[PDB]
């Protein structure tokens, strides 16, 4: 399955280029381990805050591109964790 | 787009493209310091494709050497009392 490892006080981002009107879906779940939640942010090509979620253990967020361009999906670890947070996720386009 | 870059800060923008796609950058420093900025464009393999030091403006086109996300970064390495303001456009072919 798809996942990302996020070190303490770090952000890991993923990118998709899509056309206006395209459905985009994020699903995520923090993996098994010592940590329960993650910060998530989705931003559009002109820095629109599409989604911002703090301290979420899991989530589903579906939206439609409002313009052509690159969309940014970011996971942030805001704590001084001794090991990185692991988060399972998928980004579905169309 | 206008972006403010504080003293000793960096601001990056990202475009995901396919190999061979043309990518245009136009930029001009509008305000701050000596009206100069450092520019770095880096590919998804961490291969830098453009580095400009202390540039006041530029217009360039690049061809992506591989699929993935390219990072366009503006860095202000002066201890300016004001931030640099850069006006820029990234065009993707």
PDB file of C-alpha atoms in Angstrom:
ATOM      1  CA  UNK A   1       0.000   0.000   0.000  1.00  0.00           C
ATOM      2  CA  UNK A   2       0.983   3.648  -0.486  1.00  0.00           C
ATOM      3  CA  UNK A   3       2.412   5.575   2.462  1.00  0.00           C
ATOM      4  CA  UNK A   4       4.666   8.428   3.503  1.00  0.00           C
ATOM      5  CA  UNK A   5       7.148   8.798   6.366  1.00  0.00           C
ATOM      6  CA  UNK A   6       7.205  12.240   8.027  1.00  0.00           C
ATOM      7  CA  UNK A   7      10.055  13.218  10.358  1.00  0.00           C
ATOM      8  CA  UNK A   8       9.604  15.473  13.384  1.00  0.00           C
ATOM      9  CA  UNK A   9       8.723  19.069  12.470  1.00  0.00           C
ATOM     10  CA  UNK A  10       8.722  18.122   8.791  1.00  0.00           C
ATOM     11  CA  UNK A  11       6.317  18.253   5.867  1.00  0.00           C
ATOM     12  CA  UNK A  12       6.042  15.791   2.981  1.00  0.00           C
ATOM     13  CA  UNK A  13       4.137  16.821  -0.135  1.00  0.00           C
ATOM     14  CA  UNK A  14       2.732  15.131  -3.216  1.00  0.00           C
ATOM     15  CA  UNK A  15       1.653  16.724  -6.466  1.00  0.00           C
ATOM     16  CA  UNK A  16      -0.870  16.147  -9.247  1.00  0.00           C
ATOM     17  CA  UNK A  17      -1.424  18.165 -12.428  1.00  0.00           C
ATOM     18  CA  UNK A  18      -5.061  18.198 -13.540  1.00  0.00           C
ATOM     19  CA  UNK A  19      -7.552  20.047 -15.707  1.00  0.00           C
ATOM     20  CA  UNK A  20     -10.436  22.158 -14.428  1.00  0.00           C
ATOM     21  CA  UNK A  21     -13.478  20.108 -13.472  1.00  0.00           C
ATOM     22  CA  UNK A  22     -11.523  16.955 -12.603  1.00  0.00           C
ATOM     23  CA  UNK A  23     -12.522  15.141  -9.430  1.00  0.00           C
ATOM     24  CA  UNK A  24      -9.681  14.590  -6.955  1.00  0.00           C
ATOM     25  CA  UNK A  25      -9.859  12.410  -3.885  1.00  0.00           C
ATOM     26  CA  UNK A  26      -7.574  12.051  -0.886  1.00  0.00           C
ATOM     27  CA  UNK A  27      -7.917   9.166   1.560  1.00  0.00           C
ATOM     28  CA  UNK A  28      -5.523   8.802   4.470  1.00  0.00           C
ATOM     29  CA  UNK A  29      -5.058   6.858   7.706  1.00  0.00           C
ATOM     30  CA  UNK A  30      -2.209   7.044  10.203  1.00  0.00           C
ATOM     31  CA  UNK A  31      -0.482   3.671  10.342  1.00  0.00           C
ATOM     32  CA  UNK A  32      -0.080   1.436  13.368  1.00  0.00           C
ATOM     33  CA  UNK A  33       2.504   2.680  15.835  1.00  0.00           C
ATOM     34  CA  UNK A  34       2.902   5.155  18.665  1.00  0.00           C
ATOM     35  CA  UNK A  35       1.266   8.118  16.955  1.00  0.00           C
ATOM     36  CA  UNK A  36      -2.434   8.639  16.331  1.00  0.00           C
ATOM     37  CA  UNK A  37      -2.789  11.674  14.064  1.00  0.00           C
ATOM     38  CA  UNK A  38      -1.279  13.915  11.385  1.00  0.00           C
ATOM     39  CA  UNK A  39      -1.791  17.399   9.922  1.00  0.00           C
ATOM     40  CA  UNK A  40      -3.017  17.582   6.319  1.00  0.00           C
ATOM     41  CA  UNK A  41      -3.213  20.473   3.858  1.00  0.00           C
ATOM     42  CA  UNK A  42      -4.331  20.624   0.226  1.00  0.00           C
ATOM     43  CA  UNK A  43      -3.552  23.729  -1.816  1.00  0.00           C
ATOM     44  CA  UNK A  44      -4.274  24.695  -5.395  1.00  0.00           C
ATOM     45  CA  UNK A  45      -2.134  26.267  -8.112  1.00  0.00           C
ATOM     46  CA  UNK A  46      -2.684  29.786  -6.805  1.00  0.00           C
ATOM     47  CA  UNK A  47      -2.318  28.918  -3.074  1.00  0.00           C
ATOM     48  CA  UNK A  48      -6.031  28.491  -2.390  1.00  0.00           C
ATOM     49  CA  UNK A  49      -6.520  26.634   0.883  1.00  0.00           C
ATOM     50  CA  UNK A  50      -8.636  23.780  -0.426  1.00  0.00           C
ATOM     51  CA  UNK A  51      -8.456  21.666   2.739  1.00  0.00           C
ATOM     52  CA  UNK A  52      -6.722  22.049   6.082  1.00  0.00           C
ATOM     53  CA  UNK A  53      -7.060  19.451   8.815  1.00  0.00           C
ATOM     54  CA  UNK A  54      -5.206  19.375  12.117  1.00  0.00           C
ATOM     55  CA  UNK A  55      -4.740  16.299  14.320  1.00  0.00           C
ATOM     56  CA  UNK A  56      -6.686  13.888  12.120  1.00  0.00           C
ATOM     57  CA  UNK A  57      -6.258  10.136  12.485  1.00  0.00           C
ATOM     58  CA  UNK A  58      -7.929   9.452   9.129  1.00  0.00           C
ATOM     59  CA  UNK A  59      -9.879  11.321   6.524  1.00  0.00           C
ATOM     60  CA  UNK A  60     -11.462  11.407   3.089  1.00  0.00           C
ATOM     61  CA  UNK A  61     -11.569  14.668   1.120  1.00  0.00           C
ATOM     62  CA  UNK A  62     -12.941  14.860  -2.410  1.00  0.00           C
ATOM     63  CA  UNK A  63     -12.928  18.004  -4.499  1.00  0.00           C
ATOM     64  CA  UNK A  64     -12.969  19.217  -8.063  1.00  0.00           C
ATOM     65  CA  UNK A  65     -10.174  21.226  -9.626  1.00  0.00           C
ATOM     66  CA  UNK A  66     -11.296  24.827 -10.095  1.00  0.00           C
ATOM     67  CA  UNK A  67      -8.549  25.538 -12.661  1.00  0.00           C
ATOM     68  CA  UNK A  68      -5.834  23.772 -14.617  1.00  0.00           C
ATOM     69  CA  UNK A  69      -2.603  23.330 -12.717  1.00  0.00           C
ATOM     70  CA  UNK A  70      -0.610  21.510 -10.069  1.00  0.00           C
ATOM     71  CA  UNK A  71      -2.334  20.649  -6.795  1.00  0.00           C
ATOM     72  CA  UNK A  72      -0.309  20.075  -3.631  1.00  0.00           C
ATOM     73  CA  UNK A  73      -1.166  17.473  -0.946  1.00  0.00           C
ATOM     74  CA  UNK A  74       0.921  17.821   2.216  1.00  0.00           C
ATOM     75  CA  UNK A  75       1.308  15.882   5.457  1.00  0.00           C
ATOM     76  CA  UNK A  76       2.954  17.640   8.399  1.00  0.00           C
ATOM     77  CA  UNK A  77       4.338  16.302  11.680  1.00  0.00           C
ATOM     78  CA  UNK A  78       4.108  19.138  14.206  1.00  0.00           C
ATOM     79  CA  UNK A  79       5.584  17.230  17.158  1.00  0.00           C
ATOM     80  CA  UNK A  80       9.079  16.377  18.387  1.00  0.00           C
ATOM     81  CA  UNK A  81       8.607  12.700  17.623  1.00  0.00           C
ATOM     82  CA  UNK A  82      11.671  10.504  18.092  1.00  0.00           C
ATOM     83  CA  UNK A  83      10.751   8.471  14.983  1.00  0.00           C
ATOM     84  CA  UNK A  84       8.795   9.571  11.904  1.00  0.00           C
ATOM     85  CA  UNK A  85       5.035   9.359  11.597  1.00  0.00           C
ATOM     86  CA  UNK A  86       3.845   6.850   8.973  1.00  0.00           C
ATOM     87  CA  UNK A  87       0.650   7.671   7.071  1.00  0.00           C
ATOM     88  CA  UNK A  88      -1.134   5.487   4.529  1.00  0.00           C
ATOM     89  CA  UNK A  89      -2.788   7.446   1.755  1.00  0.00           C
ATOM     90  CA  UNK A  90      -4.141   7.488  -1.766  1.00  0.00           C
ATOM     91  CA  UNK A  91      -4.762  10.345  -4.185  1.00  0.00           C
ATOM     92  CA  UNK A  92      -7.328   9.403  -6.838  1.00  0.00           C
ATOM     93  CA  UNK A  93      -7.594  11.506 -10.000  1.00  0.00           C
ATOM     94  CA  UNK A  94     -10.749  11.265 -12.105  1.00  0.00           C
TER      95      UNK A  94
ATOM     96  CA  UNK B   1       1.923  36.281  -9.174  1.00  0.00           C
ATOM     97  CA  UNK B   2       3.695  38.401  -6.541  1.00  0.00           C
ATOM     98  CA  UNK B   3       5.657  36.697  -3.762  1.00  0.00           C
ATOM     99  CA  UNK B   4       7.450  38.197  -0.772  1.00  0.00           C
ATOM    100  CA  UNK B   5      10.755  36.607   0.227  1.00  0.00           C
ATOM    101  CA  UNK B   6      11.994  37.685   3.645  1.00  0.00           C
ATOM    102  CA  UNK B   7      15.665  38.129   4.521  1.00  0.00           C
ATOM    103  CA  UNK B   8      17.413  34.744   4.413  1.00  0.00           C
ATOM    104  CA  UNK B   9      14.187  33.024   3.338  1.00  0.00           C
ATOM    105  CA  UNK B  10      13.248  30.893   0.331  1.00  0.00           C
ATOM    106  CA  UNK B  11       9.883  30.514  -1.400  1.00  0.00           C
ATOM    107  CA  UNK B  12       9.223  27.608  -3.746  1.00  0.00           C
ATOM    108  CA  UNK B  13       6.591  26.782  -6.331  1.00  0.00           C
ATOM    109  CA  UNK B  14       5.925  23.411  -7.915  1.00  0.00           C
ATOM    110  CA  UNK B  15       4.764  22.105 -11.288  1.00  0.00           C
ATOM    111  CA  UNK B  16       4.242  18.444 -12.157  1.00  0.00           C
ATOM    112  CA  UNK B  17       4.884  17.678 -15.824  1.00  0.00           C
ATOM    113  CA  UNK B  18       5.776  14.937 -18.278  1.00  0.00           C
ATOM    114  CA  UNK B  19       9.184  14.469 -19.906  1.00  0.00           C
ATOM    115  CA  UNK B  20       9.795  16.891 -22.770  1.00  0.00           C
ATOM    116  CA  UNK B  21       7.205  19.423 -21.594  1.00  0.00           C
ATOM    117  CA  UNK B  22       8.315  23.032 -21.979  1.00  0.00           C
ATOM    118  CA  UNK B  23       8.362  25.146 -18.820  1.00  0.00           C
ATOM    119  CA  UNK B  24       8.692  28.918 -19.008  1.00  0.00           C
ATOM    120  CA  UNK B  25       9.755  31.229 -16.201  1.00  0.00           C
ATOM    121  CA  UNK B  26       9.530  35.012 -16.383  1.00  0.00           C
ATOM    122  CA  UNK B  27      10.471  36.990 -13.298  1.00  0.00           C
ATOM    123  CA  UNK B  28      11.258  40.519 -12.221  1.00  0.00           C
ATOM    124  CA  UNK B  29      12.221  41.813  -8.796  1.00  0.00           C
ATOM    125  CA  UNK B  30       9.777  44.625  -8.047  1.00  0.00           C
ATOM    126  CA  UNK B  31      10.998  45.904  -4.672  1.00  0.00           C
ATOM    127  CA  UNK B  32      13.539  45.378  -1.907  1.00  0.00           C
ATOM    128  CA  UNK B  33      17.287  45.636  -1.299  1.00  0.00           C
ATOM    129  CA  UNK B  34      19.290  45.898  -4.514  1.00  0.00           C
ATOM    130  CA  UNK B  35      16.381  44.476  -6.538  1.00  0.00           C
ATOM    131  CA  UNK B  36      18.081  41.098  -6.920  1.00  0.00           C
ATOM    132  CA  UNK B  37      17.057  37.534  -6.134  1.00  0.00           C
ATOM    133  CA  UNK B  38      18.582  34.065  -6.325  1.00  0.00           C
ATOM    134  CA  UNK B  39      16.690  31.606  -8.539  1.00  0.00           C
ATOM    135  CA  UNK B  40      17.020  27.818  -8.569  1.00  0.00           C
ATOM    136  CA  UNK B  41      14.983  25.344 -10.631  1.00  0.00           C
ATOM    137  CA  UNK B  42      15.363  21.677  -9.743  1.00  0.00           C
ATOM    138  CA  UNK B  43      13.964  18.506 -11.257  1.00  0.00           C
ATOM    139  CA  UNK B  44      12.314  15.545  -9.590  1.00  0.00           C
ATOM    140  CA  UNK B  45      15.627  13.620  -9.580  1.00  0.00           C
ATOM    141  CA  UNK B  46      17.218  16.534  -7.634  1.00  0.00           C
ATOM    142  CA  UNK B  47      19.095  17.631 -10.786  1.00  0.00           C
ATOM    143  CA  UNK B  48      19.268  21.406 -10.888  1.00  0.00           C
ATOM    144  CA  UNK B  49      18.452  22.852 -14.303  1.00  0.00           C
ATOM    145  CA  UNK B  50      18.862  26.597 -13.685  1.00  0.00           C
ATOM    146  CA  UNK B  51      20.774  28.592 -11.085  1.00  0.00           C
ATOM    147  CA  UNK B  52      20.827  32.365 -11.215  1.00  0.00           C
ATOM    148  CA  UNK B  53      22.612  34.391  -8.527  1.00  0.00           C
ATOM    149  CA  UNK B  54      21.675  38.006  -7.783  1.00  0.00           C
ATOM    150  CA  UNK B  55      19.405  38.380 -10.799  1.00  0.00           C
ATOM    151  CA  UNK B  56      16.967  41.247 -11.266  1.00  0.00           C
ATOM    152  CA  UNK B  57      14.898  39.701 -14.079  1.00  0.00           C
ATOM    153  CA  UNK B  58      14.831  36.848 -16.488  1.00  0.00           C
ATOM    154  CA  UNK B  59      12.869  35.011 -19.158  1.00  0.00           C
ATOM    155  CA  UNK B  60      13.717  31.375 -19.827  1.00  0.00           C
ATOM    156  CA  UNK B  61      12.251  28.179 -21.248  1.00  0.00           C
ATOM    157  CA  UNK B  62      13.306  24.678 -20.197  1.00  0.00           C
ATOM    158  CA  UNK B  63      12.360  21.184 -21.318  1.00  0.00           C
ATOM    159  CA  UNK B  64      11.617  18.687 -18.560  1.00  0.00           C
ATOM    160  CA  UNK B  65      14.208  15.908 -18.706  1.00  0.00           C
ATOM    161  CA  UNK B  66      11.920  13.479 -16.884  1.00  0.00           C
ATOM    162  CA  UNK B  67       8.423  12.972 -15.545  1.00  0.00           C
ATOM    163  CA  UNK B  68       7.633  14.493 -12.177  1.00  0.00           C
ATOM    164  CA  UNK B  69       7.541  17.672 -10.128  1.00  0.00           C
ATOM    165  CA  UNK B  70       9.883  20.613 -10.756  1.00  0.00           C
ATOM    166  CA  UNK B  71      10.672  23.094  -7.980  1.00  0.00           C
ATOM    167  CA  UNK B  72      11.081  26.811  -8.797  1.00  0.00           C
ATOM    168  CA  UNK B  73      12.697  28.599  -5.852  1.00  0.00           C
ATOM    169  CA  UNK B  74      13.398  32.243  -5.070  1.00  0.00           C
ATOM    170  CA  UNK B  75      15.923  32.888  -2.295  1.00  0.00           C
ATOM    171  CA  UNK B  76      16.829  36.168  -0.601  1.00  0.00           C
ATOM    172  CA  UNK B  77      20.337  35.820   0.835  1.00  0.00           C
ATOM    173  CA  UNK B  78      20.596  39.498   1.903  1.00  0.00           C
ATOM    174  CA  UNK B  79      19.894  40.748   5.436  1.00  0.00           C
ATOM    175  CA  UNK B  80      17.386  43.245   4.079  1.00  0.00           C
ATOM    176  CA  UNK B  81      15.219  45.406   6.326  1.00  0.00           C
ATOM    177  CA  UNK B  82      12.375  44.762   3.853  1.00  0.00           C
ATOM    178  CA  UNK B  83      11.526  41.542   1.997  1.00  0.00           C
ATOM    179  CA  UNK B  84      12.151  41.123  -1.691  1.00  0.00           C
ATOM    180  CA  UNK B  85       9.006  41.254  -3.814  1.00  0.00           C
ATOM    181  CA  UNK B  86       9.201  39.195  -7.009  1.00  0.00           C
ATOM    182  CA  UNK B  87       6.639  39.177  -9.814  1.00  0.00           C
ATOM    183  CA  UNK B  88       6.731  35.956 -11.797  1.00  0.00           C
ATOM    184  CA  UNK B  89       4.908  33.645 -14.182  1.00  0.00           C
ATOM    185  CA  UNK B  90       5.439  29.933 -14.727  1.00  0.00           C
ATOM    186  CA  UNK B  91       4.051  28.739 -18.065  1.00  0.00           C
ATOM    187  CA  UNK B  92       3.665  25.013 -18.735  1.00  0.00           C
ATOM    188  CA  UNK B  93       3.436  23.723 -22.302  1.00  0.00           C
TER     189      UNK B  93
END
